Amino acid sequence: MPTQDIRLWVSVEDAQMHTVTIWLTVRPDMTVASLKDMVFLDYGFPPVLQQWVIGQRLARDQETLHSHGVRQNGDSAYLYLLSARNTSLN
């Protein structure tokens, strides 16, 4: 579309006491639920494990990124991962 996507930085925090940072390309029209999934798709980050933190976060996973303050690139979010995990597709 004429309007490009935006790049969102996400801080990943694990129960296993390690922290990583990821950059996600999306649009504010997206939501955490959708976003959470791509992160799962992208990083195999179990959506169950994924604890997403945004200053403008709402318990509702469905609300848009824009509604969570992600209006453009340079926006940053925080993700926490549980001790649990997932299984490899292959």
Side-chain angles (χ1 to χ4, degrees):
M1 275 286 164
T3 312
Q4 295 77 13
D5 278 58
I6 63 171
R7 324 217 85 105
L8 167 65
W9 317 331
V10 184
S11 316
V12 189
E13 283 269 50
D14 197 304
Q16 280 135 136
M17 292 180 162
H18 45 241
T19 313
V20 281
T21 312
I22 62 174
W23 299 253
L24 306 177
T25 315
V26 294
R27 53 275 319 279
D29 293 293
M30 283 178 65
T31 172
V32 181
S34 312
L35 179 57
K36 188 209 315 315
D37 187 61
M38 351 180 307
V39 175
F40 171 63
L41 300 179
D42 203 52
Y43 303 98
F45 280 12
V48 47
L49 276 87
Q50 289 186 48
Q51 289 187 85
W52 274 78
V53 171
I54 297 171
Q56 314 303 151
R57 185 185 70 183
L58 188 67
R60 194 178 186 92
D61 202 31
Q62 292 180 6
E63 290 187 358
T64 36
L65 296 176
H66 198 279
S67 28
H68 293 304
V70 196
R71 301 178 296 178
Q72 41 240 215
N73 85 81
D75 283 340
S76 328
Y78 300 86
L79 174 65
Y80 202 101
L81 301 177
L82 273 64
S83 323
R85 211 75 25 104
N86 75 336
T87 38
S88 315
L89 292 331
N90 291 285

